[model samples]
Every structure is written in C-alpha cells, then in structure tokens.
Target chain A: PRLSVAPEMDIMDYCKKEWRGNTQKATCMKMGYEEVSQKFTSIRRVRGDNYSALRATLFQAMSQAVGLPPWLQDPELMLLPEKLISKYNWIKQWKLDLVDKIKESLTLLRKKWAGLAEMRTAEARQIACDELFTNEAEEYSLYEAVKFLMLNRAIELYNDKEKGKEVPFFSVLLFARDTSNDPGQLLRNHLNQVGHTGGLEQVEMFLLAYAVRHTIQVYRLSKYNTEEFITVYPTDPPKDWPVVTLIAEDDRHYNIPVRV
Target chain B: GMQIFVKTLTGKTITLEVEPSDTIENVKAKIQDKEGIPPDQQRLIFAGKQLEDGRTLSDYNIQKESTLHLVLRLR
Candidate 1:
C-alpha cells in the first residue's frame, strides 16, 4: 500500500491528453529538440510522433473512473461513453462466472459455505444471479456498486434536473430543493467552514456528501478528478477551479480548500 | 576495513578503499567496478580535479593506508 508516494505534483498526470505528461516529455526531450527533429533522426524511428497523444488518451481513459484531485476537470471521463463502457460487459460475464463458481463451491452438508458462497448468507441461494451475488459478495459487490454509482451518477443527474446539456459535475449535485442550490455546495461550504486548505479534505467532503445524501457510500476510491485539463464553472468550484493541489495530512486523509 | 575515498561528478567525496591495488588502471577499474560505470565509461579526478590517464597513486605522493580522492563519473 505504501508504494513510495510519488509526490502529488510529480505524480503522473493520468488525465492528460497523452503527449503532455512527464514520461512523454522526458522521452521527447532525451535529446535537444534540434537534434530530435532531424530528418534522419534515429529517435523518431525508435519512438513514433503520436506516442504522447496515444499514451495520454489511454491513461485518461483507463483512469477515468478513479479518484482524482478536486480541481482538475478531465472532461474525457464524461459519463463513461457507452462504446467504452459496453466493452466492460465482460465484468458482467465475470460476475456470472463468479456466481457459478460460488454455487458450485457451496456444499449442502457443510454448515458453513466455502469459497465464494461463503461471501453470502444461506437464504438467497435461489435468488436471481445478480441479487444472489449482491447478497453474498459483500466486498466485491460493494466496490462494483460504488463504481456503478460514480459512473452513472453524472448521467442520472443529467437526465433529471439538467433539462439541457450543461451537465453538473456530479449526478447527485443537481437535486437540491432550492433551484439555485449548486451540486456539491453543502460539502464545499463545510470544507470552507472548517478552513480546509489542501484539496484532500474536499475530496473527503465530496465523499461524505454522497454518504449524507444517500445512505450508502457511493464515493469510493474510484471517484476522483483524473483529467489533465479540468473545466471550471465560475459559480461552483472547489477552489478557483482547474488544478488544485491536494496535500496529504496523514495516511488516510488529504486536504485542499477550494479556491475562492 | 581499509577505506578508499572517491569523489563523484556531483562533487561529493566518498572514500572506499585505502589499500586497493597499486596500479592507477587498477584504481580506475576498481572505482569503475564499484560505481557500475565500465572502463569505457569512466572519467576520473583527484583533489577536486580531473586526473591524467597514466597518473598513479605514487605520482600523487599518496601515503599507504591514506585516503586518495578520486572522481567516478556515471551518466
């Protein structure tokens, strides 16, 4: 767990549009630009010109669902595009496999179910696969549920209050009784009230805000700002929008007060 | 437990062996060996300065069991 915490700033920009982050920059600058740009430059032959962009796009896509700093606005992750997410129907396939494996592993004679079935109670054995899996698979199901929420939340909110295309940052952020109330305002205000400076605390507020709104914790390790270029709205920014620094105060906690 | 002193490209002096082999080439090889820089990749120095290729410990009037400052540069 304690992989040398690469300094947050030095941390790889996962949401960057490929050719923009440190790795691409370092590879490109291995030699001076003049030397690298030669018609016969061997470096060009070794690493293609599109390397940076390809890497950036891939990184942003892969890390789209993961937690990111509050300030960075990676738009690439808007609502996990259906084509991209549809490919992950494999996860459902994997889930069915997991269920079958669990059912096969369960024994009637044994008082305690073993293998994957041990994850569930005895009552839901005959239920639908999804329901049965949910009942038994506590930790795994929990993670998938959180991931589903984070990905779908934005889309759901877009369908609901957002009559037009100007989507709110979070799905749940749009449902307040007050028409003018901004999504994620309560958590942001709580952070401001507590004098939170680093963005870490704001991430916590965002998570806690979800928990307060929904009894279940929808914000998991998955919800983060992974984008290299974050779009900021003038009205509702954690800080001044776009690239807020999140400093860790401890192993489990971080703090970043939204900029005014 | 004989200590030899070496300097690095970054201008830090590190002493490793005091009674290493006698030949200057052996010293360079030993420094290169420990520093992971091959013989072809070496740049040596003495007293905060570069040393000539053929220069020996005796040429510098270094005493037995004394720390001889040498540079080992690695890219």
Candidate 2:
C-alpha cells in the first residue's frame, strides 16, 4: 500500500474548473493567463522578480484581477466576500475541493499503511490527522498540510536558478499548546530556527502566521533595508508586530529570518 | 518508453522522451540542457512525491503522456 499524490496541475485546474459561475473576478481570473505571461518578461530585471517570484505575484494579481475583497483577504486568509458570493465563489469552491483533497490524501495514506513502516502506525496517523489536520481544516476552513507541498514545488524551481543540488523534503514544525501566545512570536522563532532557509519557506511561513493571527509583518532581511516586503495580503500590519525578514544576498541560500 | 510533458513556471512546456530505465536525474540533466536550468536546481514533481533523482521513472509507474511539473530554484 503506497500513498497517491495528486498532480500539481490537476490541483490548480481542479480549483479553476469548479464552481464555474459569473463573477466580477471571472473575467479577471481569465485575465490571469495573459497578465501573468506579461509579468514573466520582467524576470531578468535586477529586481529578483524571477519566475519563482511569480508565486506571490500571481496570487496578488489573481486576487486583484477578480476584484476579491481586500479586507477579507490576508497573507494566509484567502476568502471571498458575501457581496461577491453570487459570481465569485471560486475561491470558496476551490477551498472546499481542497479540503476534500486533503481528506483523500489521508485516506490514501491510510490505505497504504502497510508499506509505511517509517511513518506512524495507521491508528496513530489517523489520530494525528484528526487532531491536527482535521482541526486546521475546521478552524481555518482549510488545512496547511498541502500548502507546503506547493512551497516545495516553488523551491525546486528556485533551486534550479541557483544551481543548488537538493531535493524537496516535507518537514513539520508543530505547535501543540493551548495557551495565549503571540502568533508572530511562534513564526519569528520558527523562521529564526530555520535561519537562512531558502525557497518557499518564508512565504509559506507568512501564510502560516496569517492562519494563526490573521495578519503578518514583513521586512527586508538583506544588508540593504530600502526594499519593503510586499505581497498580495490585503492589509498592513500594526506597529510592534512580529516581523519576518527575507535575505536575498545568497543565491544558493535565500533565508527568511526574524528581523527582531 | 514514452513522452512526458514538463511545464515551467513561466508557462513554457518541455517534452521529454522518457523511458522506464531513465532516472529522474537523467531527466533533470536533459531539462538543464533544454531549459538552461542546472540539474541541482531542478525539482521534478509528479503525483505528490518530489521525484527522486536516483529512482527510475518506472519506479513511479509514470505513464506515457503523463505530465510532470517542474519548478526551478530562483531567489
């Protein structure tokens, strides 16, 4: 018994084709095909707007193209507004489909339980999935389980550009306490621990932080502090917020550390 | 042997002549030659697992006309 992984393209298209309804963002979402292709040309600029950079760009561009509510959206929180519910339920529908996919992954993994000697026992896996995976799905209306899967893909591309030899591995950093803790603190500490880590790690962390606190702080992690960390997240962070900095100095290593 | 499609992030598609005996590492090398992305920075993904560099394509049971996703490292 072995786990089955869904194709990446299928995952994207799965969300795209579902809930086909007329919305302000439908035309905007269609525009994504052209706009993203156009944005590709600026890849060579010194701005570091490489193809890998398109991850955040496309997310924002798609959000804007579809006229998604900026207020309801954040780095981690991607949801549609009530007003746009008539036509723009794609995100909602996509998330529901994603939730189903997450469950399917668990089921597939469980079916292949006999072969997963390195993994937890089937019962243990079930418990973990129910407690952690299912809990996140319930709380946030989706889980972060596969988001890292997406991050791994992006990192693979970035690694190619830097000529670094490494394969993407899935690692989990879990928080299992029931106390009132600062969401930013956990993220800052986590980023600091994985210091100088490159690829989709930082972006994924911001999204993770967003899931926890519903907002995030971004900062430049390089020697020069002139550039601000920008993404499609709808709003700005409050002052004294926990900050994660992006280090772009190393082509081989793009670490996202806590700015302190 | 069969053809597998690899789609780049910039929306470019590269088709590879894949064989059961061909390792993903070999595919990566071919991709480097075609896309100018070095093998190390190339991350090949199919299904859910990040395709192992050392494993044969047949190990994953990759089928003819199956499309693999390619994400290159860029910082």
Candidate 3:
C-alpha cells in the first residue's frame, strides 16, 4: 500500500512489486544515489524528493509499469459505465495520494544507495545502467532496443476477470526490437557513430528522449474520450517530463524536442 | 592493513584486505568472487593506465593503508 525504499534492490524490483504485476495500476521506481548521480550528470532531473518530480515520475512509471496506458485513456477502451466512474473516483484519487509516498521512497532509496564517488569502478556504473535495462527474470530484457510489457502480467490486472501468476509486469528498452514501439531504435542505430566508447551514455540519452515522447502518447491516449471516463486523477498536481534527456555539445545550450 | 576496494560491473563493492603478499590476480579473484565480477573484464586506471594480471599491489606504489582506485570495464 506504501512505496518501498529498498536500496540494495534495483528500480525494476520496486516498480514490479509496487504494481504487483498490475504495473499500469501501480506506480513507483526504486531509485538510488548511484543511479541518481548517473542521471544527474546526464540531465537536470526533477528532484526525486520534490513533489512535482515525484508526481511526474509516478505517472510515467505507472504507464510503463503497466504495459498499456490506463484503460480510461486508451482509444479503444470503453469508458466504464457512468456509475462505475462515479463510484471509482477513489481509484484515481488513491494513485494521486501515492505520489508523495513514491517521492519519499525514492528519497530513502537514494540515501541508502548514495556514495557514488566512493565507488572505484566502471562496473558499478554499468550495474546502475543495467537497473534500467535488465532484470532477474531471464526473458525480460534480452532484447537490444525495446522492452515489451503488452500481454504481460502488469497489463492484465485491469480486466478484473483474469487470474494467473504467470502474468508479467512492464517492459523497458534494452536492445533494438521492431516489434515493440521504440522510437529509440532510431537513436540506437545512430549511436555507433557517436564513437564505440560512451555508447551507454548515448543510448541512455536516446531512451530519455523516447520516454518523453511516449509520455505524450500516453497523455493523448488518456485524454481521448474513447476510454472510460474514470476521472483518473494523477498524484500531486501531476504534469509530465516533456524532455527526459539532452545532448549538450558544450555548456552553452541544449535542445529539447518533446512537449508534455 | 589497508582496504583495497574494487568496484564490479554489477555496482557492488568488493573491498579487499591488502596484505604483504597481495597481487593483482589475487585481487581479481577476490573481486570476482565477492562482487560477481568477471575475471576477463578489461580494467583501466583513471589516466588510461593498463594493468597486468599478476602485478604486485606494492609494486604499483599503492600505499599500505590507502585505497587504490581502478576502472574495470567490460569489452
């Protein structure tokens, strides 16, 4: 019911469990100091403890946690019966309440995992990156570009009629795959040119941009009246992170392409 | 006795007790076991310095009680 702040565990575990396979329904990421430091050097992140940042991250993560956007927002989704929407407003409100819990958990996870500079190896750095890309379950992140959660467990929780433990949660972009909708494949294909070295950073930047674009897609999907009018309320005056990554040749300026 | 900590690709820290007989291979085994780091991973110093397999911890001028930092990269 509350956000979990486990530093030893990676973000994937926290995200997977919080959603309890109902990834789209649940929202949270277990971010640590090492991971946060890596993200900071790459872009100016909305502070994890900041209420606004937590709200944004929750929405995006929940969207990803659950393979599909909330049913209320899907184009093909039928609005729940008016009585259901009216009765279920708490579902929307509960998610918003969890935003603060999510922020607190992220802060705690960061504290436990802090000490980035003290670590003296690139291995630690890569592990932090892998948290975003890999997982304990074998088949989840083997792909090179896009991670797919559709038909996975997290997405299935919505039907309320289905029951099975084999269901999976969300997906993340790890390698190149055309089956899933990963705009970052365009970014990945271009990474080899950035230089064989620093390929990880290159890929991360691309994923960030792609994630931002996906957020927009989700928002549009949510706002379209096709889905049930669940009165879905995002936690903490939610907005979106239009640009999650940036490419700055130097300190002079940067360009962001996505809109929230 | 100083702490010889080497970071692994898995983001876990492997701290070693640098003894009079400690060698690079010894350190590698310790890290590989403790941090689950692969032995074949190519590692580098901050200044692009290359390290050999069996170099002595002392031969490198590392202090007896100080932490020596190395970057281990997987190719």
Candidate 4:
C-alpha cells in the first residue's frame, strides 16, 4: 500500500483522539506522547513501510535544509564516513576500490538534496519530499543508497571484530545469528531485500546513524510495562552534528517526528 | 510427513502436511493454491525468523505440530 506522511501535529491531541481508550496499549502510547511532548512540540507521523527510517530522516534533513546551508554539512559527512572508514584496516586495496563505488552509488541522492537546496519555497521542498517518498521507484533508489552505506559499514564492523577490537555485543549477535557459512554473503542476502518490509535492527540503525552523521534519538514505545524512554545513538554526537528524532512504535516500526 | 499449522492475521488457521524436503517456496505455492494468496505477496516466519524461499524446512529443523505465521507483505 502506498501512503504519504502526515503533517507535523500536536501529539497530545493525537494521543487523546486516536487512543482515547484506557487499554494498556493505549495508555503506553499516551504516556509516551506525554514524555515526548514535553520536549518536542509536534510529531510528524511517518509511513509504516519499512522505508520509514530513510524517509523520515530525509524529510527531517530536507525540511530543515530549506534555509540553512550549515545542516548540509552533516549529510555531506555521511557521504564519506567511508573515507574515515578507510583509515582503518577495514579497507584493503581490494575493498578500497569500493570507495569510489560507494561515492557513485550515493550520487543519485546527493544530487537530489543538492537540487532541493536550490528550491527556496518550504512548501515546494515538502512537496518534493512527498513526491520522492510516496513514489516506489524514487524511494527505493534512495533506500538503495542508504543500504549500500550500511553494507559497507557492516563489512568494517565485522573486520573490526575479527581483529579483536571491541565491538557492540549486538554487532556480534547480528552476524552470529545469521544462518550462512559466509558472513559477507549472509549480510548481503539480509541487506539485499531488507527495506520496504524488513525493519532495520538497532545495529543497522547504528550504521544508518553513522551514514547520516546525525545523532538518532529513539523513543521506545512498547505495550509491555516498560517505560517509554529516549536512547541516543553513540550516546553523544559532536556539537556540529544535529540530532534526528525517531520513534519505535511497539518495537515494530519507526517514525521520524519533529517539532511543529 | 510434517503437520504444521499456519495462521493468518485475522486468526484463521490452516493446516499443511508436507515432506521435510519441501522448500519454503513450495510451501508458499501450496498456500497460494489453498488460500488464494499469491506467493510473492506472502511472508512466512517460523521460530521468529523469516523463512527464505530458497531454503527448505529441514534447514530450520521443522518438526511435527510446528506453527508458522503468515504476514501479507502489503497488508
């Protein structure tokens, strides 16, 4: 099903209206709304398609990029985390050749944002977002770019773990939990058909956040008695980088919401 | 033969009897015939992990009375 994102709206009102019932699930979402509302004035609901993370990040990035040229730097840094990635043994002469490949793959999306920068109308830019996001061909192309970055990052992370550098335990679990004798092939297969259906795990979000060079703050909204709280990727971002907010609804899908 | 229960989102249950060598792709094709859902539109998950079309039940050690959950990819 094709769905467009809802505009930024007050979450408190949305909570009372959409989940007025006193069921445990409803209450958790309401409470999540309360906590989130205190800091964020609005939540722009994202499409539930597996592309929610990429769509929302692009929405936030593109929408906020209207007048400010400074934010472009963050997205720029994303294009070349591979550059810093190469400083390590992660990129051998063979893999180093893939650097140009990574850069070329993202050229489509890089051109997209650069084109959006020239459009001065906020309304026009948002229209561009909706057009790009709701259309399958465009959205999937953008998703492929993000996915390529993620694939490269997975290689580097695996190389790090193999070299005995401390990696997140989840990274170990992600690779170990897969069912292939060849780890790279396993990652390739998993990532090959990941988006638009399969949700990205926290480990992938780590790669995504790195690719975007933006801090990701995830609000875990669950049905269980767990407190709906905020967790930051990398825990802290550099002062130059901005934070992009996304909500994990009931541990199922992500929504990128911003203040009105 | 293995007897496994399949569940639709609305709680309808369907049963399937198959050999251990049956690929998940074949299972999906059987589901297409029995339930009228296209194979491309079906997603089968067992043991909380997605079943790949290229793999067989034997890969996952499917046992009798196992239950597989079905999610409509578009729904």
Candidate 5:
C-alpha cells in the first residue's frame, strides 16, 4: 500500500472521532485547524512531493490533530521505517529482505493506529501494540523482532518510571538448558525462532552490545522461584535495578563463574 | 610468539600471546580472566571486522602486535 501523503480523515472527522465533537471550543480553537489546513494545502499544491517533506508534514498534521506536542513531530516522523531505512542504509546490511518487511509492518502499524499517540499515553499504546503482535511471530526478522519488542519495552518502562514505579534496566538472558543442547544448538534454535541467522557469536555479541547502548541490564536466574540471580555483566553484586529473570543454557554464560 | 593487545570499552587494556591457530573465543577467555567480562558479552573487533567465535585469528590474517576492541553486553 502507498504511504499516506494526506490526512486520512479531514479535520472535522478526526476531531469528532478523537475529541467527541468539541472542535471549536477545544485546543483546536483557532491555531490548530489553521495549521493542519495549511499543511494539507501546502502538500497538495506541491506537484510531486518528496519523501521527507511528505512524511514530515503528514506527521505534523497528525500530531496537531491528536493534541500531541510539536516536539514529538520529528521523532514520530523518524519512526517510520521507510524514512529510517532511507536515512540509514546500513540497516540493510543486517537483513536485506527483512528491511522491506520492517518498513511495511511499521507503515501498516502506524496507519492502523494512526491516533494512538494522541488517544492514550505511551504505556497504553505499548500494551496495544504488544497485544496486536503477540500471536504473530513469523512476520518479523530477528533484528526487527528485537527492535519491535525493545521499542515497546522502552516505552512501557518509560511510562512506568513516570508513574513513580521505577522500572529496572535489567532483562533476563535466556538460553537452552536441556542437557542435549550445546551453545551452538541453543543459538541456532533462538535464531530459527526469530527467523534469521547472523551466526551465534555475532547475534549474542550484538544483543549484549545493543542492550548496553540502550541502558538495559542483563541477569541470569536459576529458576522461577530463585531469590538470587547472577549478575551477568556490568555489575558484580547487581544493584537495586528492576530484575527480569529468564532461563538460559549454562554454556551461554561464557565461562564466567556463576556464583549462586 | 605474536602479541595481541585488546582494549575494552571500560578503558581496561589486556595483552595476550597468540598463535596463528588461536580462535576468537580463546581470546575472549583470556579477556574474561583479565577483565571479568564474559565471552558472551564481549564483541571483539579487529581491523573493522568483528571477530567471530568459530573462526581463528589467522583466518583474518591477524599478525603480531595487532589491536582488538572489546565491547560488553548489557540488556
């Protein structure tokens, strides 16, 4: 499907749906409609719209229509996988074909939830996205899968933090635990599930590296009821961060002595 | 014996003696001993190529006095 170049619903319809018909008295009193109308008008007048301009102006109008702040305009527009891939071509190096799938998936997701960012808080949006994708596994590549999960996780954590809950930065590092499986097998199985292989060591290394960049902590717990978990890296005693424990293969511990 | 210098993101430097047949995973073990960073968490880069665990150092034509970078995993 082609990208949305213009507003999907005109100003009145969008307002009626989003705000329950208090258009003139609401925040869209004067400046809002004028801004969105001008943007919609400007885009139509351009003979042929370039990708960036079309994407940015559409995002700007959508944000205004939904009562989002102006600052969100840039990040919202940048979140479009099409724009992201175009700007960062190196993304193709990870998975060439999957890149296109990511673009399509994100495009569809935004279109389906066009007013998501404006209708509810970030937490609600994250939950909705999670629910929508929970049963659909085969549609995403490894990189896209991790990115999609991680992005919503970040949003959920951010919302938790805002509500004074203090979501911890740690995630459980899970691996194969059955006696018959080796590290290689564990890696392969994990990759198979994610639908792409970037080599066992490569994927593991990238997982850790990306986690560090995103300020996420890693932990290894022996069992569900286990009180103490091993701090895999970046800490010895594992400080007071939110703990997410996962079951993993012992060999994936990388020869580090696991102190229970 | 050839020497390979490894630099961790934490600003810790590790030096190791290497044979051409040494695998990248072996080097990770050495770094584990010196820096306490696990092999799974370490990403070693040499000459712009990430050292894969299954491959040998010599496979990448690593020579004497080469330098490798070490990155740790977090999430």
Candidate 6:
C-alpha cells in the first residue's frame, strides 16, 4: 500500500473487524491495538517507513498547537544556532550561513503555527490547519529547526554524564551497560548524520520531549507495570504543558494518538 | 557458523563468528557477552540495509567474510 494518512477512528473496533478470528497472530495483534485503544480514540493508520514517526509527530504537534500553547513559539529556535556551533566547537563560515537559512525559513514556520491563534470557527480553522501542510517548504525547516534543539540537548546531556554530574533527568545515563564503547560513537551514529536524516528510539524519544519542551507519553505493552504500560519522558514536565502522545504497536514503530 | 567482520565507526573491525541462520539480536547478544555493550544499543548494518533484531542474517543474504557496520545507539 502507498504511504498515506488513514482517517482517524477508534483503533479497537478497527482491530476487531480486521481480525474476526482468533489465530495466534491475530490474537497477539488484537491485544496490541486494544492496549492502544484503551487511552487513545482518534488514532491514524500510517506506514512504518523511516520517516512516518517523525512526520506524524510534527503533523500532530503543529495541528493541535492551534490553541497557542507556550510550546508553539519556538524562541528556543533562535538560541539554538549559537549553542550548536559552540558545542560542535566549529567556527566555520558555512555553519554561519546555515544558521542564516534556518532563521529565514524556520522562523516563518514558527509563525505559521502562531498564525493559527488568530483563526476560529471549527471548519475554517481546520481548513487553515490543513493548508499548513500544503506549503512544502515549511516541513523540512520545521524539522531541521527541531533537530537544532534536539542535537543541542543530546550533546549537553552526554557531556553531563561523561563528567560524572548527577543529572536528574531519566535519560542522563548509560547507553551501554558494561561501558565498553565510547559514548560519542553512538552519539554520532544515532544522533548525528550530515545532510541530516535521523532515526528515533527510546532515548531519542526521551530527548525529543525535552527538545520540544513538552511531555511525550509513549504507550506500549510493558513487561512490568510502569504507569499502565505507558512511559512519560523527561519526568515532571510543567503541569500545563500539552502532552504529545505516541504509541508503539506490534510493528514497533511510533504512531500518533489522535485521541479525539 | 561463519566469520563476519563487524566494523565500528572508528575503523576498528570486530570479527564475529556467527551462523548465517543467527538473527541480528543473537549476534548482538554475543557482542554483549564479548564487548559488554547491550543488545538494544547495537545496530548491525549490512549490505546498506539496517538489520532488524528478529531477522536472520540469511534474510539479508549476509555471507562469510562480509562486513557489517555495528553502529551503536543511545539508550
């Protein structure tokens, strides 16, 4: 099937209808969708391609952000260029030029979400929200913008752990239990890619929540009862900051919880 | 079992003796035993494709003396 965003629905009913019989495979998957349907209502069907999870998270972030939450205006966006250059310890002219590009496109994307604050009437706002994606340029810039903060945060935390500082964050710790490998190698493998396409995992998810300055609540079947098979990353986010919910299903890819 | 060279980013080639039938996760567990890196943190890339844990090396047509990139991910 082609990669497309399926319409929102209660995924539990979708699961049951798809798997009318109780086979070993269906039985297992039925449990997965059921677990997801427990807390989310308006989940969409997206392909588990490399880009889907990141795209879905961005789509969900900008769409729901019509409410004008504090997270929408990315003042953190401006602060990022300087911090990134310093951390990388590179003072190159090309880096300076790249920051110039980010300022022009990414800031406008910030304003695009902010522009929604002026909109009202359910359908009208929805159309504007839909229009948001039609502008193709905004998508990359927004993600590139997000990468700035995420990369910066990931590096800082890595440095913190290496220095033996007791960083209180849940993720300010080990990647390898036995400490055989250098942390920077994984950091480059997982976090850094030039001409920049990146993948996400548990630590990336946790790092991303902090990057956005919002809580990311992930739902999946757990081996132990860790807050009802859900894990909230970057513990104790501001009580009012909107939570962006993600669910990992049988396929083990991130899906947006459209919780209508 | 066959021999495969799993290279890290830094040019060090770690030779792993593994069966073609062994899954990536199985090889990763072997690395954990030998190198002390956890399985989840290890990403074994071969033939320009990312190897999934449950999929066997044969699934990727991984052959003897073939080199796979053992890239690590943050926890």
True contacts kept of each: 0.00, 0.06, 0.00, 0.00, 0.00, 0.00
Go through the candidates in order and give each one's DockQ: 0.01, 0.03, 0.01, 0.03, 0.02, 0.04
Q: lDDT scores for all predictions?
A: 0.30, 0.38, 0.31, 0.64, 0.40, 0.61
Off by over 4 Å in 6: A1-4, A16-21, A66-76, A86-96, A158-166, A174-187, A193-198, A221-228, A250-252, B1-75
Please report the candidate that would top TM-score against the real structure.
6
Chain B of model 6: TM-score? 0.92
Q: How many backbone clashes does candidate 3 have?
A: 17
How well does chain A score by TM in each candidate?
A: 0.21, 0.22, 0.20, 0.73, 0.29, 0.73
- Docking quality of model 2: it rates as incorrect
Residue pairs in collision within model 6: none
TM-score of chain B of each: 0.56, 0.89, 0.64, 0.93, 0.87, 0.92
Model with the higher lDDT, candidate 2 or 6: 6
Candidate 2: misplaced stretches above 4 Å?
Answer: A1-260
The per-prediction i-RMS, to one decimal, reads 25.8, 10.9, 17.2, 10.7, 12.0, 13.0
- The candidate, 1 or 2, that scores higher on TM-score is 2
Best by lDDT: 4
Candidate with better TM-score, 1 vs 5: 5
Residue pairs with clashing backbones, model 5: A168-A242, A175-A248, A175-A249, A208-B73
Worst 10 residues of 4 chain A by lDDT: A88-97
lDDT (tens digit, per residue) of candidate 5 on B1-75: 688888643234689878888888888888878656678777676654556887998799888888776644432
Candidate 1, residues A134-189: lDDT per residue as tens digits? 22343233323333333244334435655665543332322221221333332233
Task: Specify the CAPRI tier of model 4.
Answer: incorrect
* Candidate number that wins on DockQ, 3 or 4: 4
